[PDB]
Structures are given as C-alpha cells and as structure tokens.
Amino acid sequence: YTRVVWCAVGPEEQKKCQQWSQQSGQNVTCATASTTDDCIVLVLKGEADALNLDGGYIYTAGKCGLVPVLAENRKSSKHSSLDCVLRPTEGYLAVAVVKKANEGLTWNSLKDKKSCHTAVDRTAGWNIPMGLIVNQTGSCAFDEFFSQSCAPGADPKSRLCALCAGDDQGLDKCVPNSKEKYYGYTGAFRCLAEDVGDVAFVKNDTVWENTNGESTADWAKNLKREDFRLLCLDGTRKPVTEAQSCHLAVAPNHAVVSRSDRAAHVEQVLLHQQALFGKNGKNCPDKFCLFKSETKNLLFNDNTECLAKLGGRPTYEEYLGTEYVTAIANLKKCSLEACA
Ligand SMILES: *[C@@H]1O[C@H](CO)[C@@H](O[C@@H]2O[C@H](CO)[C@@H](O[C@@H]3O[C@H](CO)[C@@H](O[C@H]4O[C@H](CO)[C@@H](O)[C@H](O)[C@@H]4O)[C@H](O)[C@@H]3O)[C@H](O)[C@H]2NC(C)=O)[C@H](O)[C@H]1NC(C)=O
Ligand SMILES: *[C@@H]1O[C@H](CO)[C@@H](O[C@@H]2O[C@H](CO)[C@@H](O[C@@H]3O[C@H](CO)[C@@H](O)[C@H](O)[C@@H]3O)[C@H](O)[C@H]2NC(C)=O)[C@H](O)[C@H]1NC(C)=O
Ligand SMILES: OC[C@H]1O[C@H](O[C@@]2(CO)O[C@H](CO)[C@@H](O)[C@@H]2O[C@H]2O[C@H](CO)[C@@H](O)[C@H](O)[C@H]2O)[C@H](O)[C@@H](O)[C@H]1O
Ligand SMILES: *[C@@H]1O[C@H](CO)[C@@H](O)[C@H](O)[C@H]1NC(C)=O
Ligand SMILES: [Fe+3]
Ligand SMILES: [Zn+2]
Ligand SMILES: [Zn+2]
16 A cells, blocks of 8 residues: 555566565565566556656656656755755756767767667657757658667667677667666666777766776776767867766756656655665665665666655656757657657
C-alpha cells in the first residue's frame, strides 16, 4: 500500500534495484523492462509506480499523462544556506566534446564525421544536437548527417548504430540500456575516449567525472582533461573549463515521474528513502547508497546530492520550460506510446 514499485531499465539497474529493495525491507520493490519506453508503459498500466527520467523522456511521459514528482539536484554554488531538498534546480550543460588531437574539427565541420550519442530521444545526447543540426541544415535527414554513429535506440542495421558495440558477448547491439557498451553519458564519452567516434554529445559533468583520476575504470584511468576540447556554436574550440561560455544548451535536470494519481504517495516514500540511503543518509555508506553505482549512473546519476521538491507544482511543460518543449516539438515533426 505504501509500497512503491520502481521500474529498472535493463539487468544492471535491476540488480541495483534489488539491493535497494532488500535494504528497504520491501518498502520499494522492482519491475524491469528492456527500455525506458517500456518502463513508461508499465507505469501507465499501473504495474510500476515510478522511475527517474532524462528530460527527453519526460516529454514522452508527459504527453501520456505522467507528471514530474522530484528532481535530481547536484552540487551548487548559490542558494548556499538552503537545504538540498528545497533548493531550486539549476540544470546541466549539454556540450559537444572532441579530442584536442583532432585539430581543425569544429561545429562547422561535423558533417560526415563519426558521432557518439547517449541515446535517441535524450536531451544532451540527441534532442539538442540533432535539433540544432536540423535547423542549420534545413533538412530532416539527420540520419544522413554523420557518416557513422552510435545512437542507442536507432535501427541496428542503420548507420546510426554502426559504431555501437553491444554487450560483452557482442549481443544487444544498440539497445538503449546499459548492456550496450556505449550507452548513456559514460558510454558515449567512452565512445569518444576510445576514438570510436569523433564527437560525443554529453553533459559538462561527464567530462570531469571521467578524467584526471576521478574514474578508476580501465578505459578512463589515463584520460586527461587537457586532451579534450568543447565545440562552441560560434565555430571555436575551448577547454573543458569553459563550459559556461561554450555549451549547446542548458538542460532541465532528470526527474522522477509517476502517474498523476500516485504522485503524492511516490513523493512521500522517496523523501523517506533518501533520508536513509541518500548522500548524508542514516545507512549510507554503511549498508546502501542510492546515489552510487561506480560511475555507471544506475537509476540515478552518481553526482546526485538529493532529490528535490519542485514547487509551483509543475506540469511537465512547465518543468521542461517553453524553450525546450518547442525544440522537441520541431524535431519530432521530422519523424499507446504516441499518447499525443
Ligand atoms: C562541470 O562539471 C563539473 C563536475 O560536476 C563541475 O565541477 C565541480 O564543481 C563543484 C562546485 O560547483 C565542485 O564541488 C565540490 O564538492 C566536493 C566535496 O563534495 C569538493 O571538491 C573535492 O572533491 C572532488 C570530487 O568531487 C575532487 O576533485 C577533490 O577531492 C575536491 O577537493 C569541494 O568542496 C567542492 O564543493 C566539484 O569539486 C567539481 N567537480 C569535480 C569532480 O571537479 C563544474 O563546475 C561544471 N562546470 C560548469 C560551468 O557548470
Ligand atoms: C529550430 O528552429 C525552430 C523554428 O525555427 C525553433 O522553434 C522556435 O523557438 C523559438 C524559441 O523558443 C520560439 O520563439 C518564441 O515564440 C513564442 C511565440 O511565438 C514566444 O512565446 C517566445 O517569446 C519566443 O519568442 C518559436 O516560437 C519557435 N518557432 C516555431 C515555429 O515553433 C527551435 O527552437 C529551433 N531548435 C533549437 C534546438 O534551437
Ligand atoms: O539555473 C538557474 C535557474 O534555474 C531554473 O531554470 C530551469 C532549468 O533548470 O529550472 C526549471 C526546471 O527544469 C525550468 O523551468 C527552468 O528553465 C529555464 O531556465 C533554464 C536555465 O536553468 C533555461 O535553460 C531554460 O531555457 C528556461 O526555460 C529556474 O529558472 C530558476 O530557479 C533559476 O534559478
Ligand atoms: C518502511 O516503511 C515504513 C512506513 O514509513 C516505515 O515505518 C519504515 O521506516 C520503512 N523501512 C525502511 C527500511 O525503509
Ligand atoms: Fe540527460
Ligand atoms: Zn547558455
Ligand atoms: Zn503551473
């Protein structure tokens, strides 16, 4: 009754959810689906209660009647005396990242290069960069812009999946879940790091969290911030320290959604769950930490400080903001799960 069913995407999220379930004494239990779109359908059916979503999926879920409940909040600078749970969200910066050694590559010479995207339909990985490219090109043929890409969730036989690697056995190539080696923020950054692609569309944080020893992962151990550059819309290249002046957009933070009729109950349970397993929580790091997965961003982003109350009681349109909603609307003209 005051039990919340979380929806995990893929087997690694399922494993994390199971540990949370055990530690929560079954106040939270787990349903699993192979894609984020399927988890949305489970929530619509009432077979799951909630999951945390990137803004592009929130647009999808919102059209079907789902609502944002709490948002990820990461480290701040202003609103300093304010408690994390009450602090306004700031958004994250969507960036385009390349290797310094790939000289003369700029926003203006991206045509026919190789690209690394977090997944189709996601904010930094797809909606913002492809939205910009469509506008600048005056063409809906965004699938013919890059020579080859990894964009998890596209047709595995298309050039949009040519660079995706699948799992350890080479299966599930291009699936939009963490079994795909190049899925998500860390996966697309890895796709650039290994020189599989020429450019990764990720967020500012990703670059910092995976360089200069911040990650102990084999592929990331030796990466240095200085070996990367950001691509600016004016055609210049800048150091990764200049993201505030060289990003493609500011994105709304990922947020937990649920059916409108279940929102209040989901909010109550999660606030108590974070008091236990959140950043300063009673049982973290001793038993279980909700916001940790070893740089893998499972269920929540690893840089999450807390889940924050929204205020204004957002509709999903208000939460995403009018600038962003119109951008997606326009990109989607180029090409129940279409609930509107
Ligand atoms: C781009 O993304 C970067 C990664 O998120 C941002 O850099 C971070 O900036 C925040 C402040 O806004 C720093 O917060 C710190 O929190 C730490 C304690 O919890 C302390 O830093 C210590 O830990 C880091 C790892 O988190 C280590 O590098 C080191 O031990 C350090 O002493 C500080 O007390 C500080 O508040 C954070 O350190 C930065 N992250 C990293 C990993 O460098 C950056 O601002 C973003 N840029 C823009 C323009 O938004
Ligand atoms: C790609 O281009 C499209 C269309 O050229 C962009 O859509 C446009 O976005 C702007 C900014 O949000 C909208 O301007 C707004 O107009 C409304 C009223 O018309 C007003 O409320 C705001 O003050 C603002 O001026 C504009 O309406 C919208 N155009 C259309 C036809 O929908 C889109 O933003 C571009 N994509 C990207 C990723 O930038
Ligand atoms: O960043 C300071 C700024 O944060 C808020 O901005 C957004 C996006 O984070 O918060 C809500 C929730 O997602 C959105 O409605 C706001 O979007 C607007 O502002 C962002 C800049 O952050 C911008 O990219 C969008 O184009 C806007 O639509 C709030 O506006 C406010 O608290 C400020 O403190
Ligand atoms: C389970 O939820 C009930 C209802 O609030 C609460 O009494 C208890 O603290 C919760 N236990 C855990 C481990 O989350
Ligand atoms: Fe995102
Ligand atoms: Zn800006
Ligand atoms: Zn409102």
